[PDB]
Design a protein around this ligand. Structure first.
Ligand SMILES: Cc1cc(CCCOc2c(C)cc(-c3noc(C(F)(F)F)n3)cc2C)on1
Ligand SMILES: Cc1cc(CCCOc2c(C)cc(-c3noc(C(F)(F)F)n3)cc2C)on1
Lengths: 273, 255, 236, 40, 273, 59, 59, 57, 40, 40
């Protein structure tokens, strides 16, 4: 594959470098169209910039917390973090979000990796070997209310049991209801004057609940859970303007008020180098 | 003697001519088409009114002044009250369509100004309030009037900073979307053919706007010494390959 | 039992590894694909589309005006604009090219820089765009700029001039992050003759500048960008 | 060799190797030849 | 392959042992050229002295430290070692450096092995199971400022998570910008009177940040991190004089002042055995 | 699940072992090779070049 | 000893995984199958049978 | 596998939508039996509802 | 590949792919044709 | 057998088995034959 062909002097009626950008087209002008060039080869395929590679690596998409402690007298297990849940979404942590939002529609399979790390902030005689249970609770499935509900039986919901300090790994097929996931959605759930706007109404993927299976020890253990997402078998459509301003909320395109200029201001002239 | 500048577009019983065009853009190089069996899900036989809805509808003219920020229309919203197309929109549960957008603006070889005409699929607007505030139905359904980017914020409405495309992205990058410029010194019209773009075969035409059309002044308007400091901008849109499905009662929408 | 020996790295989680893993949803049948226009396969595809450069940084805040390059009537020899070619910073940082380029550590290839005139039809002008390859300073006058790669642009019927910034380098790749040894040079524009306005016409005409990559372009070593961040996890 | 029954569990797809920028760079109705006047 | 051929008496006009070293050549004189020899075979291939083997084993290239402790009130996480980073280079530890510097240009793929070991200098009721995160921060990527920045999301930067006491392993392709890495560089980044001299301006490979994912425990844990490098698929050019004097700095060829003689001094005559 | 038995030495890091390992930079395309004179393949190649002996240690 | 590298997820128990496992009752011979009418293969089979709707909730 | 066949207007002596549920049978009436339909495909096998999968976790 | 001697130790069976609702939907003695009067 | 997609992840190359010291030992313009006077 040639990068540049050999091209010499020129004196024509054919002017490749004069165009009309109001047509909306970006004419494929090459260096050999405006200067004398020599032959060079690409020695390059562009593998690393393939959308499969671009979205094909794990990125942290959520961090949450649960803890192992005596549940005696706790009236709201959920609030006490005896167990916690995550309303599944990929737009909470901004790094992966900006990448995905480089496109309008996106379709792919997902590979999840869940890392659980223990912590004992105050006096403990040892570190306990806790087992985490991550259960997927799809829309319509009964949500856990107590860390040891009948819901954790998980007869139909899928769930993994892994050691804290260890990692959990599994993949999920493309689960969108449509032919592709929407990164943006200029619409509502119905024609209502007050209903929510944006993908907020589209990305209703249920949530996944986490808990520590072990009963409590004398001391209290804080387990932090990090979920990583890697896309595979990727397809992307309709490229768009990259995000410029900071995000403020999951799902909305909203940006903060009194935000700072994102375009750098010259320390001098428009003639400055 | 055929030129990129002279064109005629005939849809239904409506025809458009322009002697100062700059070619025409066909979004993602795809001409609109009807929904093929292989992609269909909805089992209802669809209705194709053809020429009674696939024709040019001219919106109300806007006035471009030295201080204009830009305008934003949404489809199919902007045509929600246009003849039979509009009626079909509310009488059916589902619908799908493509369009030919034709923006007009003439001046003289003494004027100067440059409008960016772009089509943005799934243009999800942002709330000027930031945080997690939503943008109420009415404010993204301005209809034929469209949204004036130089108008003041309003409760429940979207942010209207031209610089941030009403969505947190920079104006300069709007060119990644199918667009065209109306550079008075070259142009006087912009034409964009839009194929149906969505993640579903067919969809509700009232609760979802597939794309929004934006006419944004980049190089400000300049009129010759002592001339009227304004120019009109006219938007004409024609639906094409329009299909309606699931006919019934007729929606009653917010406001 | 097959005898085995586990190697160093066992149990590690390399975010970049590409392995198989059990499916949590066995027998699930995903939704059929339907045709959707505008499919993107490679980022190198989209960086070939040019976007506007906010060449006129000079303002106190982000404005439509930062994209307008002012041109002044009856000025001779003078400079219209200038900029270094660190495509991963400066004026380029927010463009689609600069934005995508920042997702990678290395870049190589030729850049496509365009200028579209927006002044009245009855006006005229001849400008000169110049690219100064690394090794010398940014040109300080037309004569100096003219000694390097350049294009004399005659404004007219065809509104846009496309000047290529041919890959001129010894090392075959440069860092997207501004690095001296890896500098790309300078870009400048000057009045070849001058801008002439017609009667009854007054003020300023502007130039719109665009940037995009040539099929020449190469990008490698994916990395996180400095164009986005957060202090706390976002919530609904 | 694939160890699992479902397609979703296989590893990455491998380079699309299609690459056609024209649907974004030249989405014009009338073909424009490099060198020929853009506006004739 | 013969090591020596059979060679008998000699009385010629052909004198193989008389040469002129000022030509700059080392004539391939053999024992059979100056003495009577018998036939012997090599029984040797020289596998172990192949550059692939010479640079093909792991060598420690860096040692650093991070620690797990309460971050409350710490104004500079980096300084407190809540996380630390390494400006990647292979000339900090001298053993591998001298080997690599036997050549001028060198090209190869790299296999890294990262070993993390824990230590609890003062009172602790147990040893915690900490998980280390090593993230590669290429030039241009945002550097971490706090041990729990958004930067550790690592959406595009590659990173590994492994247990302390365990080891991390992965390989990296040749990432030089040129066709080979320079072990030496007689130049600058530009024609400037004050700019730096040497490979210091060439080897700008960014750095890799390390941190402990776990929150703090009651006691403090000191984690020491050792990085090992093994070259594979090796290519080397332009052999040079081995280093004789001790090194003083990363990248420069500088040697200390008032250094000791490196050539041994005879305990006697030039005639001494 | 294929039944296996891990052997002594599992988990060890022998600096001298030569195994495969996952690449941290998938799809990265290294710079093309260009011709460079003076390539060295074996150290036995260069020790055949003679250098000066500091025979007169005495100083 | 075959060199191996264990991957993330090792030791996990995914209730949804479908692997092989040793039989706790080797050589056990299960009871012969006999014909039994009404075999169901898919739930989509039985939802095609209609049942009464308690349309008159009102009580 | 077709989900729905193409079916147009109708004016017959054959009334597929009139049955007698007291027979104990659930006649396989389809949308194409009571409305005008277009052709669509299943793109679905029903793997996940197989008893092997239902009790298989 | 199966690693164990007993059948019980193998993994899941894979889709029956039979599917005949009629034994539940149409368990009638006299065949009833769609369109023909249910009670003649 | 290689388990990974990238070349960088494979193990060591194996003996070059080229070995030509002459480019360092005899980089002279005019060939010098062993036995013939070095300076004629
Ligand atoms: C955009 C976009 C795309 C997606 C896909 C979300 C996938 O949702 C899941 C997740 C996150 C996990 C599981 C899952 N299956 O088993 C487990 C367990 F191990 F966590 F229990 N988790 C299943 C689905 C459908 O979400 N937003
Ligand atoms: C001379 C010379 C040659 C080199 C090669 C340095 C390679 O640089 C790296 C390193 C050290 C690690 C990674 C890396 N990728 O993933 C990880 C993680 F696991 F550490 F995160 N580290 C990537 C590159 C390009 O540096 N100096």
């Amino acid at each position: 594959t040639v990068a540049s062909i050999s091209s010499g002097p020129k004196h024509t009626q054919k002017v490749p470098i004069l165009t009309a950008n109001e047509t909306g087209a970006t004419m494929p002008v090459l260096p050999s169209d405006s200067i004398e060039t020599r032959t060079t080869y690409m020695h390059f395929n562009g593998s690393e910039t393939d959308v499969e590679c671009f979205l094909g690596r794990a990125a942290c998409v959520h961090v949450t917390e649960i803890q192992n402690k005596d549940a005696t007298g706790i009236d709201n297990h959920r609030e006490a973090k005896l167990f916690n849940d995550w309303k599944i979404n990929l737009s909470s942590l901004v790094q992966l979000r900006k990448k995905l939002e480089l496109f309008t529609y996106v379709r792919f399979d997902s590979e999840y990796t869940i890392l659980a790390t223990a912590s004992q902030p105050d006096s403990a005689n040892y570190s306990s070997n806790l087992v985490v249970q991550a259960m997927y609770v799809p829309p319509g499935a009964p949500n856990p209310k107590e860390w040891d509900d009948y819901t954790w039986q998980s007869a139909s919901n899928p769930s993994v049991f892994f050691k804290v300090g260890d990692t959990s790994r599994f993949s999920v097929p493309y689960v969108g209801l449509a032919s592709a996931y929407n990164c943006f959605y200029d619409g509502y759930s119905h024609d209502d004057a007050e209903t929510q706007y944006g993908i907020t109404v589209l990305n209703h993927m249920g949530s996944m609940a986490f808990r520590i299976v072990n009963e409590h020890d004398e001391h209290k253990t804080l387990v932090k859970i990090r979920v990583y997402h890697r896309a595979k078998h990727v397809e992307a459509w309709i490229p768009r303007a990259p995000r410029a301003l900071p995000y403020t909320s999951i799902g909305r395109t909203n940006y903060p008020k009194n935000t700072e200029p994102v375009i750098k201001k010259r320390k001098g002239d428009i003639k400055s180098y | 003697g055929y030129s990129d500048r002279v064109q005629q577009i005939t849809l239904g019983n409506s025809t458009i001519t322009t002697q100062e065009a700059a070619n025409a853009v066909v979004c993602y190089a795809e001409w609109p088409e009807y929904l093929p069996d292989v992609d269909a899900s909805d089992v209802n036989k669809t209705s194709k009114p053809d020429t009674s809805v696939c024709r040019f509808y001219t919106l109300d003219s806007k006035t471009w002044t030295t201080g204009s920020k830009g305008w934003c229309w949404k489809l199919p919203d902007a045509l929600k009250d246009m003849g039979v197309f509009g009626q079909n929109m509310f009488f059916h549960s589902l619908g799908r369509s493509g369009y030919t957008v034709h923006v007009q603006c003439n001046a003289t070889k003494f004027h100067s100004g440059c409008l960016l005409v772009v089509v943005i699929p799934e243009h999800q607007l942002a709330s000027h309030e930031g945080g997690n505030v939503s943008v109420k139905y009415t404010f993204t359904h301005p209809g034929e009037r469209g949204i004036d980017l130089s108008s003041a914020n309003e409760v429940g409405g979207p942010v209207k900073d031209v610089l941030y495309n009403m969505n947190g992205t920079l104006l300069g990058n709007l060119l990644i979307f199918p667009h065209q410029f109306i550079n008075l010194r070259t142009n006087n019209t912009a034409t964009i053919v839009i194929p149906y773009i969505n993640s579903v075969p067919i969809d509700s035409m009232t609760r979802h706007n597939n794309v929004s059309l934006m006419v944004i002044p980049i190089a400000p308007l300049t009129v010759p010494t002592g001339a009227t400091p304004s120019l009109p901008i006219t938007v004409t849109i024609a639906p094409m390959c329009t299909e309606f499905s699931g006919i019934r009662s007729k929606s009653i929408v917010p406001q | 039992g097959l005898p085995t020996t586990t190697l160093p790295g066992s149990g590690q989680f390399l975010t970049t590894d590409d392995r198989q893993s059990p499916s949590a949803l066995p027998n699930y049948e995903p939704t059929p694909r339907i045709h959707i226009p505008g499919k993107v396969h490679n980022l190198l595809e989209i960086i070939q589309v040019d976007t506007l450069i906010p060449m006129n940084n000079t303002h106190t805040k982000d404005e439509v005006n930062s994209y307008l390059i002012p041109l002044n009537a009856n000025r001779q020899n003078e400079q219209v604009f200038g900029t270094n070619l660190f495509i991963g910073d400066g004026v380029f940082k927010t463009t689609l090219l600069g934005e995508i380029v920042q997702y990678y550590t290395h870049w190589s290839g030729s850049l496509r820089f365009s200028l579209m005139y927006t002044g009245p039809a009855l006006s005229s002008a001849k400008l000169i765009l110049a690219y100064t390859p690394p090794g010398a300073r940014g040109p300080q006058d037309r004569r100096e700029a003219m000694l390097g790669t350049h294009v004399v642009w005659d404004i007219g019927l065809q509104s846009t001039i496309v000047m290529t910034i041919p890959w001129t380098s010894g090392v075959q790749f440069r860092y997207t992050d501004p690095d001296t040894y890896t500098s790309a040079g300078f870009l400048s524009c000057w009045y070849q003759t001058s801008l002439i306005l017609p009667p009854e016409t007054t003020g300023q005409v502007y130039l719109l500048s665009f940037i995009s990559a040539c099929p020449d372009f190469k990008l490698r070593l994916m990395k996180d960008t400095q164009t986005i961040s957060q202090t706390v996890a976002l919530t609904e | 060799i694939n160890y699992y029954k479902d397609a979703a569990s296989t590893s990455s797809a491998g380079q699309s190797l299609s690459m056609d920028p024209s649907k974004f760079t030249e989405p014009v109705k009338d073909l424009m030849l490099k060198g020929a006047p853009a506006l004739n």
